[PDB]
Amino acid sequence: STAGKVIKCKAAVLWEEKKPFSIEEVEVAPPKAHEVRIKMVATGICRSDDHVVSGTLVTPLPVIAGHEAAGIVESIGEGVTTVRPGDKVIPLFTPQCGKCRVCKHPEGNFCLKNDLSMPRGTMQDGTSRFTCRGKPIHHFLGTSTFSQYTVVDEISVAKIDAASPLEKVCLIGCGFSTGYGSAVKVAKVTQGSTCAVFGLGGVGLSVIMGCKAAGAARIIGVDINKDKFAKAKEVGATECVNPQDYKKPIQEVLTEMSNGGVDFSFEVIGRLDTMVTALSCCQEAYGVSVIVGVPPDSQNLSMNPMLLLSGRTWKGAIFGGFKSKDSVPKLVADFMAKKFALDPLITHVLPFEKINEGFDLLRSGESIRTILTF
Amino acid sequence: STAGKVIKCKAAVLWEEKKPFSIEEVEVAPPKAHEVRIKMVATGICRSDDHVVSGTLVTPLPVIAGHEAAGIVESIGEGVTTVRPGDKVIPLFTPQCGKCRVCKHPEGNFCLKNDLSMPRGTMQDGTSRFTCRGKPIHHFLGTSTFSQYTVVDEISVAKIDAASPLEKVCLIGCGFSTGYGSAVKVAKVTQGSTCAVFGLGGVGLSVIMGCKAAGAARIIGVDINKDKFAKAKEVGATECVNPQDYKKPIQEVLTEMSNGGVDFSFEVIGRLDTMVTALSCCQEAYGVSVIVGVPPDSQNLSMNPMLLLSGRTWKGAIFGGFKSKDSVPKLVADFMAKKFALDPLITHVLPFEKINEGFDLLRSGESIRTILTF
């Protein structure tokens, strides 16, 4: 029934930054050529769209935020070859347009038709498909998943398995894939290796799961908050070290207990000081350090080039280096084949009308992951 | 004849820093087990042993500096399986002891029995084999090649081809191998790629030669001194850009002319600002930047983590990532097979008694490479 035409539905609008979201009724335009319209089912809440709210990630306001979700396909636009109505799908905040030189590159994943670098808050055609009372509402990362319905370009949706639990596989649209790929795809962790993960929120928990999948024989999880050590442990850490317990610097204590430094170090906290501390404690002649993510507000960090000189690799990346459209079906199939559990990351499930409440949880942080259901 | 016993010969001594070298007569002790004694033939002059002289590279004084040389084997000590008297050889300032975890590691090359990290200026047994009038003279990087004779441990000498031109292949003991490996072994430059080398002294010229060997279709050489552009060009650069010609920042102009940033950027200057500028102008989603070398005095450099986040790799290394003992024979055989020329790097050849003069050349810098002959 909704197929040819505009749908009217509730969605979360930010009309102004540093304001809670308004649940509004909006008009979701029908999809033009190579667009898909998706009925959302479950969307996670993540720091990055809370950065929008604070003014920190600058994306044009008013906006429908949301980038991490799974749902079902309703309308498909003209020339849509990959999805067909009724398909389970996950919006891709970092696309896979297939044509550019990053998509062609055998390792690059930060697709040039992305709205992260220079955010205009639109669909590829420069327009928006949201209007709240005639006023237009901008799209976020060409996903906007805090809406009952949304329209994405065919390069920003991946089709997934029919039997897929969408209240659990929506994590594969951001946080789980960002950490499990920082371990499996970016650092390319090895059989036998010693990994150290810094920070153990949902992303640090996804790293440990990846490092576990590659066969690391040690995963040292380090967090200044003791309460984090259990789930981390559950998920794969062999040891957990609380920096505030030692009189020394932890890179000392970590090189010390690693016999000269760990193989792979990962920075899941996002701070400048720990990006440096995690660089300084993988082995000198061959360790790899991977910055899993860095806040859009970050300033410069002081580092002494000597550290790289020994023979270290410093690596950063977006979405665990996964080419989005290719990989997300393959991760879901893996979840489907009981390779990894998403369950200890999902700590809360709230109805979508309780989005502001999910934020409260994220902001005082004891909440690994809040999922919002439609 | 000299074989069982102490040789008395001239060598360059630093008795005190910031002093020119004294040509002295010294007593080179006979080699103990697993030591080799080498009659030098040609040794190059390089910034690193001039850093010693300035106080900057702290190594114990008095010392016989010199790390880059080729020569012939005179005495071998007890249990020496790799060289036999009369063998052409090159002292290895960074060893290949075969046993440690860096030597075992498939990429690591900064061997743990090295005297670079924590320099004690001795042979592996903690003693010295030099005495000038009863007073002991320390060894440099377990090589000390500014002496007519020297003793090295069997892990710090590689045997090379009999027909080898030792006045030309001594470059393979430091400067040529440090740049040609930063291109061929560390960055692993590719067929078709666009490389940018920053700084074009003898090392930057060795990079261009490596990038050329890997098949890069562009080698942009960039130096604020115009006079460098010719030899660079000769050696393989396709274009040379002089930063002072543009009103803009060169990473702009370089990303601009590279269509979004080069593949591989190399910093051969050693400055902090250009380590940053070369990081910032390889492609965002997949470029690799390699710091070829950094002065022992360097302080911290300000950098914004964002640069790594896109998907960049920052890599440093010692001796072009070559495992010393394995690789140097293979490079010489390549020179021998007319794969690369060492000739445009060798600009001066002076007799060894003119060491201080070779320094003068290096310090006012128009001299690509001064070789000293015995």
Ligand SMILES: NC(=O)c1c[se]c([C@@H]2O[C@H](COP(=O)(O)CP(=O)(O)OC[C@H]3O[C@@H](n4cnc5c(N)ncnc54)[C@H](O)[C@@H]3O)[C@@H](O)[C@H]2O)n1
């Ligand atoms: N901007 C990004 O792209 C990005 C990616 Se990861 C990231 C940062 O990570 C967080 C999101 O990832 P996440 O799911 O892990 C939520 P999080 O906030 O729980 O992650 C940070 C973790 O580090 C811990 N921590 C704080 N300081 C220290 C310290 N000095 N040493 C060791 N542990 C410490 C926290 O207790 C926590 O578990 C964000 O809140 C932000 O701080 N930003």
Ligand SMILES: NC(=O)c1c[se]c([C@@H]2O[C@H](COP(=O)(O)CP(=O)(O)OC[C@H]3O[C@@H](n4cnc5c(N)ncnc54)[C@H](O)[C@@H]3O)[C@@H](O)[C@H]2O)n1
């Ligand atoms: N400490 C190390 O391990 C190490 C490795 Se190479 C390195 C530095 O490199 C030099 C040794 O290597 P080399 O054989 O190339 C001798 P060099 O001094 O000739 O190398 C530096 C090159 O960079 C050029 N240069 C200076 N400033 C700029 C600039 N702002 N932008 C572009 N070009 C510029 C110089 O004209 C020169 O060709 C040392 O003198 C030192 O400065 N230190």
Ligand SMILES: [Zn+2]
């Ligand atoms: Zn693309």
Ligand SMILES: [Zn+2]
């Ligand atoms: Zn996210």
Ligand SMILES: [Zn+2]
């Ligand atoms: Zn070794």
Ligand SMILES: [Zn+2]
């Ligand atoms: Zn050198």
